[PDB]
Amino acid sequence: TCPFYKKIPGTGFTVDAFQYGVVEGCTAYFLTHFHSDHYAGLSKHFTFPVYCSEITGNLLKNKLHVQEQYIHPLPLDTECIVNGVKVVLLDANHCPGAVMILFYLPNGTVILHTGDFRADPSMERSLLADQKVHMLYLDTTYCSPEYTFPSQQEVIRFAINTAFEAVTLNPHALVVCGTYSIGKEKVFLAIADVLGSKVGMSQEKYKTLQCLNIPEINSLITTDMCSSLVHLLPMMQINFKGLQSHLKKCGGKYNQILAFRPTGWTHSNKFTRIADVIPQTKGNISIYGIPYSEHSSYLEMKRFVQWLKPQKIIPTVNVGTWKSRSTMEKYFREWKLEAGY
Ligand code: NI
């Protein structure tokens, strides 16, 4: 049974609600982004209208085989009428194709559902500037002040400088980057650009990247592993055993691996600056964990919410424990008293 925080009152609509069977009353199912916790339940046998971005629609058709007749793509930043209700899709600054949804209810209530997002000051100059929001359905993944991490630009700078130094010292080093979902593509694209290489990967991953509308993608990626000195591998293989096994397969072309694991936040963020990050090393293999986040930090979240001034907040992450729920409610009240709304 579908939980309350996935239903939009006063509508026939649900958000990210495909794992509950046929939801009673639902005439349109919205999907914010193509991550498995959110699409859980969709397949080629789905027969209800799905509303989403163009990029999400490419992935539903090619990767999950949903039939074309049930995929409804909408442009961003554009007022659209769906089943008699005005909606707008906004870029979420999450993974490719990820959106927030603004719903203009027939009674005059305005609701924003963030999906998953990384709040940014640029959002304060979207179509959100123009009007009031009564209810905010909020991605609260990192809603606690311990959750700190650097900008995505600082992280990429570290990765580019690290890879370029290592391969200039040893032209026989291979770079490997882990992946397990869409998102975080800048990590491997930026490193391959500094090295003058295409990114090599499996046919399955190549297929996924070809759905993302990235400009000039055919110039940037390949399935010919022998021609590339940046390889992608599943995240589960980014360990000393898996990397050893990979280096064997490269026919004596390489004598060293430098690997990256993009994570979210980890507790070593509570001690170490990005500049001071060091790898784990065994013999001719080194592994960097780098804190490349596609979710808001606590301070980014707080800023966004204090600017929007919603009347009510409904968390969509960390909702399963009383301790989490109580912690989040406390910070919402602090934020409101401090800003005066
Ligand atoms: Ni996500």
Side-chain angles (χ1 to χ4, degrees), residues 217-240 242-247:
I217 192 61
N218 294 333
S219 69
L220 311 174
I221 65 177
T222 187
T223 49
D224 180 7
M225 311 297 276
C226 286
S227 72
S228 146
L229 60 134
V230 179
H231 299 173
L232 306 189
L233 286 184
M235 200 73 88
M236 292 200 72
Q237 201 161 3
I238 306 308
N239 51 73
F240 299 124
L243 292 163
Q244 281 164 196
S245 172
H246 188 71
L247 186 59

Side-chain angles (χ1 to χ4, degrees), residues 87-203 205-215 217-240 242-247 249-269 271-281 283-284:
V87 305
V88 171
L89 300 187
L90 309 162
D91 202 282
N93 188 43
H94 185 52
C95 62
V99 300
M100 314 190 289
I101 311 160
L102 254 194
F103 298 96
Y104 291 83
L105 262 49
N107 68 13
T109 297
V110 178
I111 291 180
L112 176 62
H113 196 304
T114 66
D116 284 347
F117 85 141
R118 189 164 180 177
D120 192 74
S122 64
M123 297 167 176
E124 301 166 20
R125 295 169 285 283
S126 60
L127 306 198
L128 292 175
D130 313 38
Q131 102 286 276
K132 185 191 177 50
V133 174
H134 303 80
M135 312 196 85
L136 178 64
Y137 288 70
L138 180 61
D139 167 13
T140 45
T141 293
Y142 296 129
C143 188
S144 193
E146 75 274 23
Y147 297 116
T148 68
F149 37 72
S151 68
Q152 290 178 166
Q153 193 280 330
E154 290 173 84
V155 178
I156 289 306
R157 172 96 286 195
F158 173 86
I160 289 165
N161 284 3
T162 302
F164 181 76
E165 171 169 320
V167 170
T168 301
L169 293 169
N170 182 195
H172 301 271
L174 178 62
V175 179
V176 180
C177 296
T179 188
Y180 47 25
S181 63
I182 65 167
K184 311 188 185 187
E185 288 78 13
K186 191 69 174 175
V187 177
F188 56 83
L189 294 168
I191 288 167
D193 171 83
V194 79
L195 301 177
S197 184
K198 299 189 179 188
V199 185
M201 61 197 64
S202 69
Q203 294 183 256
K205 183 77 184 176
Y206 182 90
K207 184 174 179 188
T208 303
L209 295 187
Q210 285 290 162
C211 299
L212 307 183
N213 295 342
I214 289 168
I217 192 61
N218 294 333
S219 69
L220 311 174
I221 65 177
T222 187
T223 49
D224 180 7
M225 311 297 276
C226 286
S227 72
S228 146
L229 60 134
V230 179
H231 299 173
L232 306 189
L233 286 184
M235 200 73 88
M236 292 200 72
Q237 201 161 3
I238 306 308
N239 51 73
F240 299 124
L243 292 163
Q244 281 164 196
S245 172
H246 188 71
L247 186 59
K249 301 167 203 128
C250 296
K253 212 152 180 301
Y254 308 109
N255 63 11
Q256 181 187 344
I257 286 175
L258 173 96
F260 298 89
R261 293 189 333 88
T263 63
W265 173 91
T266 71
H267 189 51
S268 54
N269 277 276
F271 301 124
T272 324
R273 277 184 145 61
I274 184 57
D276 296 323
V277 165
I278 59 166
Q280 289 192 213
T281 299
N284 58 347

Side-chain angles (χ1 to χ4, degrees), residues 33 35 38 94-95 116 295:
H33 69 296
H35 276 166
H38 299 259
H94 185 52
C95 62
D116 284 347
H295 295 274

Side-chain angles (χ1 to χ4, degrees), residues 14-23 25-35:
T14 56
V15 180
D16 298 351
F18 301 89
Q19 65 169 295
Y20 307 108
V22 180
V23 179
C26 188
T27 52
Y29 291 77
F30 287 77
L31 182 54
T32 66
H33 69 296
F34 194 80
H35 276 166

